[PDB]
Symmetry: D2
Subunit: 326 residues, 4 copies
Amino acid sequence: ETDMLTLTRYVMEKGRQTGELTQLLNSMLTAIKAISSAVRKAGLAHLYGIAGSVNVTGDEVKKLDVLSNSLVINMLQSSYSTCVLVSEENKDAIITAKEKRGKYVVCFDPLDGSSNIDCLASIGTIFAIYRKTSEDEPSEKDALQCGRNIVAAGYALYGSATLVALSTGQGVDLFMLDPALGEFVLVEKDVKIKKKGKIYSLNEGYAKYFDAATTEYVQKKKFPEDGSAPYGARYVGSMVADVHRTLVYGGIFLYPANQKSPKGKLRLLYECNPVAYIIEQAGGLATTGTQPVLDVKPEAIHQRVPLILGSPEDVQEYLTCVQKNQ
Amino acid sequence: ETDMLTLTRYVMEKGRQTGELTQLLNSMLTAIKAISSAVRKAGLAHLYGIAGSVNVTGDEVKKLDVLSNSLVINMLQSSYSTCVLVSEENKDAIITAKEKRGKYVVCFDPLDGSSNIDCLASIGTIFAIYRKTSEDEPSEKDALQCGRNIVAAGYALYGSATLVALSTGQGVDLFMLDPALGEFVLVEKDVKIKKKGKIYSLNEGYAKYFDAATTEYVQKKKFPEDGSAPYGARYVGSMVADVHRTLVYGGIFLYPANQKSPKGKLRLLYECNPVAYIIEQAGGLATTGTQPVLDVKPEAIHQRVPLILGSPEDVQEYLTCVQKNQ
Amino acid sequence: ETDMLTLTRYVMEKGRQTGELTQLLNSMLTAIKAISSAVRKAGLAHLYGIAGSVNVTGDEVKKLDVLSNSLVINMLQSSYSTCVLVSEENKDAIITAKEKRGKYVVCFDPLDGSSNIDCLASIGTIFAIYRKTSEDEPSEKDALQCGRNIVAAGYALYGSATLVALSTGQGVDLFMLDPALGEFVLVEKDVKIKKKGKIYSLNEGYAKYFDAATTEYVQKKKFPEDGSAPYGARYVGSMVADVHRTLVYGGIFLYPANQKSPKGKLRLLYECNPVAYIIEQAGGLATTGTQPVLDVKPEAIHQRVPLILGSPEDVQEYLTCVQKNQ
Amino acid sequence: ETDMLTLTRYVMEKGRQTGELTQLLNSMLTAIKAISSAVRKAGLAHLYGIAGSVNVTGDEVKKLDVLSNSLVINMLQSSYSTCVLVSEENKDAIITAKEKRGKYVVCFDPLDGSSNIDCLASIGTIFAIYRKTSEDEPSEKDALQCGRNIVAAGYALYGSATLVALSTGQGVDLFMLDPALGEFVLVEKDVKIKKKGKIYSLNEGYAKYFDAATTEYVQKKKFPEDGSAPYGARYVGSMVADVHRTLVYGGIFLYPANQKSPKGKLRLLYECNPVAYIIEQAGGLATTGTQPVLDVKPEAIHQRVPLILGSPEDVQEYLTCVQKNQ
Ligand SMILES: [Cl-]
Ligand SMILES: [Cl-]
Ligand SMILES: [Mg+2]
Ligand SMILES: [Mg+2]
Ligand SMILES: [Mg+2]
Ligand SMILES: [Mg+2]
Ligand SMILES: [Mg+2]
Ligand SMILES: [Mg+2]
Ligand SMILES: [Mg+2]
Ligand SMILES: [Mg+2]
Ligand SMILES: [Mg+2]
Ligand SMILES: [Mg+2]
Ligand SMILES: [Mg+2]
Ligand SMILES: [Mg+2]
């Protein structure tokens, strides 16, 4: 192998029409590399178990949560490309120090699927990048753009192998960590989700608390009324893993509102919008049940929303159930 | 770190009461190491997609299936410790060549969770080791012992990190691959499963085809009749991953008989018995619904069985549903 | 470690006063990473022994020579930053294709110390970067600048660890490959060579062919006339290794003219100028015996010169011997 | 690659005629693996510079010296295979604790070429294994056997790649660390040194202090009296590196007695005997100048001797110079 298409090179060669974005990305990828390495020897570096605090969303934080958060913050700030960061792990927006100030806003989940670290299930890092457009002092309000205004977004999946899915507006590209070469190399370009899939994905243990629309849709997946095979169920419990399987296999992923979580559980800014962006870029759909997730005007950095995404025909059929029930 | 407890050293220091077993294991671990490395750069070494054949169980084989199978076969044979191997990927039993003949029989699944390779979910390698006891020529019949007669058994999980769970009769020990040192190092000794868990795990997309006992038990998990919280649902779709989460978090994993699979789908010899062995060693239970899996006399190397395993109280409650319905 | 000073970040944060240079470098580093990985498993990937040709300097080429050459060429060209490359391994200058044309000229030795690959001695990659200043069509003549006009230069040393020494005009910085993180991280900033050292380094097996000046200087190292200890001898036989030891320990490295090589043996463009640049940046000296190497106007891409470099006082004393003998 | 010849497997398959030796070796290799990994990120893990003490041979100890020493001691002791260790870094012999006592004696240099760590030259680990033959309490005296009585011996070279040379009495075999697989794999079997070489290797900076025999031999290498080409000079300054180059390229390596070191400088037990053993096994010679090194009865664990080894015809010619001068 003497001509490897690294991430950086592919972004440079397609983007031939902005560098500052590509420098922000290279910092993110460095963080992702560092995280991936820590994840991969987590038990040996005695890194499982609690950290000893709760975040502003009610999540019992792990030792990795803290570690991967500083990696991302330090790396992003050091790029000279950011002004405002939002993180699952910090209460307020982190304003970049003036001497390092750049034009971009990043919303990120430094480690997703935390309840699944101990059992070595796939886990990930999720990010959305915006451009600061307002003229005032950098504040949390700059991070409150509609996901419709994302400049680049994606996720890292620390699974059986380490993978980045990324989009800067021209489709989704999949990159993979080459351990030999310590870099991300392109493996799939311009991935498009199947129009219709064969897998449904949700925590079905909340059945007792679903609204009628959800209850009905699920019934159709398991008990179709047209002789077709019932859909297979899969639910990893790490949103990155479930969302990535959705992208490459097809199907639907659901984390909707329920009685216990009246407005959904997943965070709009740094979980829902980044994956919504990827799925839309891949020809799929991503909805709250009433509108596309990317069209929701966020009103608070840690705001939650319902999320239903995946193959267009599957989401369309889910939205029918919503209409048929309101 | 100047005093690392490697697998080999822990087995040597506890087993102070057989080397030939420990040499067989060291060969297995070499195979596992090789597999883990291949898995981890699978997309880059262009290793996804089909192989171009079906196995004797009806499974569309992947390129890895073939690769990891030869690794295991070559490694095991080379140990001078085996006489008979059974593999998911080979139609008949593989008799070791006379000049390399040893006393042990190994049943293995060289790569489990094959439908989940492309989406980078956790996948694994599963193995059970027996002692040849009969006096005749090494044949498939030597591989047909009850799992009750296992001498050592375990699995490798190629997840966010690479882990081996192993038992030689004195409890379960968890080892992890140290990438720096290229060896397995002990992380948890004598793991014991929770008496009762909070997670149920099955492909719920077969709901339409469950027998009444299964339908009823699941109803109790989602709609308890005693005010308690419903159990959470998790289903990775790779039996190693689901079984490992069961071991460390607690709960229940189910792949029972259904209309489409009248006698279950998982293979007795190289899937069910090895995990049944681990779970029993950890204080859990593993049943076909009518007897403990380890007590089933196998009659054919590729025989299937129903599998329900996990926290004792959870399995007990499942067996009630079976009694209450027969 | 949550705030790592990677190469890229250090160059970005010091250079705060040009990106296109930093993109050229990132491509070089990718090549260096790839080479380092190949070197490190060279025997296993059956990569020792001949390639089956001779280069335009009379060197029997190895399989690595060829491999590392394409890596460097493909990587550099792909940066969109080059117009002209010179390589030890190619007869003529390689003009970049118009659609990828940039402003920089690179002279490189893709793998140095080739006679030392088989015995696993340290080996390296050497490079000098110039800015195209002339207005005509990109040609070999653009690569014929005085090393005095270097914009950035350095070397990779694939030793017990992998290290890059780099200068862009503001001193020498040492970076090291972090295998965990797949990147170069700063280990020493602004290294300065000892004014006077205690080690002399040359192939002493050419004693019979040295000119009087060299013979005399060496006599003074082994038989001092002032009661001081004689200098220690060290000679690895890979110029990068010997030159790097010179930089960090102090002393002198000599590959001067001799009867067999009347004008020296080392190549001016892609061996001598890059190390001359590093040593001068570090407060040392690097001479042909009659002038500073960086002041030689090259007249041909594969031109050779005598090289004597290292601690200033040691080189000064060597130049005395030259004056005292002409 | 589906059938890799690992060290362990090659030793097992050739030794088909002792396991306890092979378990001792597997512990050594684990130590070597750990050391190799530490060496390779030595600058990043801030591991250069002094330790703050002197050993009983007069050597300013490094931080690695200490680290690699405990690795070797802990690993070897844990094998249940040793009774007595001798180390360059410990004043007295280390008697194994009774409950871990085995039959073997190991003499080792846990890290050789310490003055060359900072400049990233090749460095190594050197070892000789004996069988305890005496009946008394394990003491230092058990470590005082003639190298003629070695049961297995070799070295690790942490160079551009990591290599082990090993002999158990049936020739020399070369193994290499596969980073992918974390194990040593055979690369060359039964290596034999060239009858006569073209490279001479010694610290020539001691010229002023050589005895006449050495002065004369060196004169013949640089100023032959028969029209042949003078030999090339190479001197890395790490005995493992120089000795390994000698083995694979041919030639001679010299660290003889001189005025400053009247009885030589290299340590008999854990430097000279192990390499003497390798070279003799490879058809070469290794002498003190008056007898074969392996025939010297050691009288003290930290005893020094002159060492001249390499291609037989070259050593023979050196011994002539000794005879011609006594
Ligand atoms: Cl997973
Ligand atoms: Cl070296
Ligand atoms: Mg959390
Ligand atoms: Mg999170
Ligand atoms: Mg999250
Ligand atoms: Mg299969
Ligand atoms: Mg399988
Ligand atoms: Mg399977
Ligand atoms: Mg060459
Ligand atoms: Mg070269
Ligand atoms: Mg060269
Ligand atoms: Mg020392
Ligand atoms: Mg030493
Ligand atoms: Mg030594």
